[PDB]
Design a protein around this ligand. Structure first.
Ligand SMILES: *[C@](O)(C(=O)NCc1ccccc1)[C@H](C[C@@H]1CCNC1=O)NC(=O)[C@H](CC(C)C)NC(=O)OCc1ccccc1
Ligand SMILES: *[C@](O)(C(=O)NCc1ccccc1)[C@H](C[C@@H]1CCNC1=O)NC(=O)[C@H](CC(C)C)NC(=O)OCc1ccccc1
Lengths: 299, 297
């Protein structure tokens, strides 16, 4: 199974650059609005503890340089929504796809179009860790790059990039400017909670193994959801939610293996280990393929 | 992380091509649509297709090309090796600057997997030394293409034709010549013995150092030939002096001589990873080139 990203073209058609002074990052141009991280308005001195409301009062439309390539887009209004700046522009993006703004849950995956100076460099598939960081390739200049899923013709934007944490992982907001996790857009030392394994995705991976004929680990038993969750937490696995059980529904129906029976098989793997065997050609359980990802690549 | 090129410039070229009950993808550049020639086969034909004979029996109107909701009229067709070229009466305004290249084993490229002319996903692949690729391709993916992007220029290097029994994939360049000893007939084909792309494993090890990981480093060194003796024993490709040269930038960046990293890789091959992981992986990764690593660090 490959880490497979969504085709990026519908998002490429929405990327622009936004500059204040000498600070340039990326923005997202949808209809007549450009969305970008509010710290574009910061100098280095503001970034230690910015007063964003005061910084913004000192700004006017004519202080923002928005470019699609080398072509300037005139700003006609500005406002701040949580940690994102919204710049109204005088031109509706003709490449605007059908879109939605969604706030994803930890464990969900998405594609990131890594951009520098409004120019796309690469696309890759990311998972939101339970501690609300992502393990990505973001360099200086990548802020404002977005993460997304594509359903039918509709791009669901879920992530906008803002920062790198001391440990090398990345943090950001949804497109309404609300950070994922306990982070703030200040150049201060901040720590992500200890990470955990994404149980629902491991289960999806076991279902994938079954679909492909690799099923030695299926046992004759079952468990309750509460009993599984209490055990799982002792192994630094996330507890399952009702939504997790529901999104495993299609794979459970495809295989005829009840979700809680698979939970009991996983519990045995956690308590006894692999005993030298492999699953899908690996002794490690994979936790960055969602149940949807599994469906995508198998069917 | 494994990064693919942005696929928009290729998405605007994908179309659907149908002949009989066979539908797959084509690549529409200017006024020509390129697709695998086996679109003209039937159940019967597939086992031993005499393509020139099957093709001479086709008319332009036996080919249905669809770009979204619009049918493109075929006004001419020709065959170049395993690729069919359909001339259509309208030019693709979304045609990027492009070239056709034939890549070398060990080089990487992005694949835009498409079904019924519609882009479905994008991922990064390497041309294996045995000229397969480890892709993710289902029924309907034939005609999907692989590419690299340099400046605004798309270099197409791969069109998809086949899944081998082992689950790996085979296909052609855009001149229609297969990579490898494979044939576009409906038969179970085995590849040559695969080997590991050593220059890429070394680039990946350097990448792991850059990201603050070095449990596998050691104080030893090795000559080039002595490393290559061990590499070949473990079905790793030999490392050439041009490979060593190509690795210079990563060596400079990290202060680790190429042959010192070869000594670390030697140790890993002989001992294994002893349960440990490098950049999250239980296995040595060989599908990042030195260029891929440098660009991303
Ligand atoms: C992001 O602001 C960005 O990419 N800005 C454009 C730019 C152009 C030229 C030089 C620098 C930046 C940036 C993205 C970071 C940088 C390295 N990897 C990333 O993901 N984000 C930031 O710099 C944060 C801004 C504050 C206001 C939140 N600060 C931050 O990430 O703090 C830690 C850090 C770690 C390494 C390097 C820089 C900063
Ligand atoms: C490719 O022809 C394709 O996608 N065709 C359109 C299509 C196919 C089937 C149903 C609907 C529409 C196809 C791609 C394969 C299929 C599964 N995964 C892939 O990557 N390619 C082929 O089917 C090959 C055609 C030949 C004529 C080149 N056949 C093939 O891969 O055979 C392998 C094989 C294995 C064992 C025994 C015999 C053959």
């Amino acid at each position: 199974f490959r880490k497979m990203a969504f085709p990026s073209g519908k998002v490429e058609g929405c990327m622009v650059q936004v500059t204040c002074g000498t600070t340039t990052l990326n923005g997202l141009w949808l209809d007549d609005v450009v969305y970008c991280p509010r710290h574009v308005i910061c100098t280095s001195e503001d970034m230690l503890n910015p007063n964003y409301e005061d910084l913004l009062i000192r700004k006017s439309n004519h202080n923002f340089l928005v470019q699609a390539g080398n072509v300037q887009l005139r700003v006609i209004g500005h406002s701040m929504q949580n940690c994102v700046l919204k710049l109204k522009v005088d031109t509706a993006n003709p490449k605007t796809p059908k879109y939605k703004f969604v706030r994803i849950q930890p464990g969900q995956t998405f594609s990131v179009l890594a951009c520098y100076n409004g120019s796309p460099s690469g696309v890759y598939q990311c998972a939101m860790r339970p501690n609300f960081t992502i393990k990505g390739s973001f360099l200086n200049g990548s802020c404002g790059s977005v993460g997304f899923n594509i359903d039918y013709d509709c791009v669901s934007f879920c992530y906008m990039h803002h920062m790198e944490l001391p440990t090398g992982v990345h943090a950001g907001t949804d497109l309404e400017g609300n950070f994922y996790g306990p982070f703030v857009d200040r150049q201060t030392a901040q720590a992500a909670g200890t990470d955990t394994t994404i149980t629902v995705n491991v289960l999806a991976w076991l279902y994938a193994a079954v679909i492909n004929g690799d099923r030695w680990f299926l046992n004759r038993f079952t468990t309750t959801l509460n009993d599984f969750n209490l055990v799982a937490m002792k192994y630094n696995y996330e507890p399952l939610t009702q939504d997790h059980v529901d999104i495993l529904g299609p794979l459970s129906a495809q295989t005829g293996i009840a979700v809680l029976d698979m939970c009991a098989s996983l519990k045995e793997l956690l308590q006894n280990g692999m005993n030298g065997r492999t699953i899908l050609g690996s002794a490690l359980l994979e936790d960055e393929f969602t149940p949807f990802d599994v469906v995508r690549q198998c069917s």
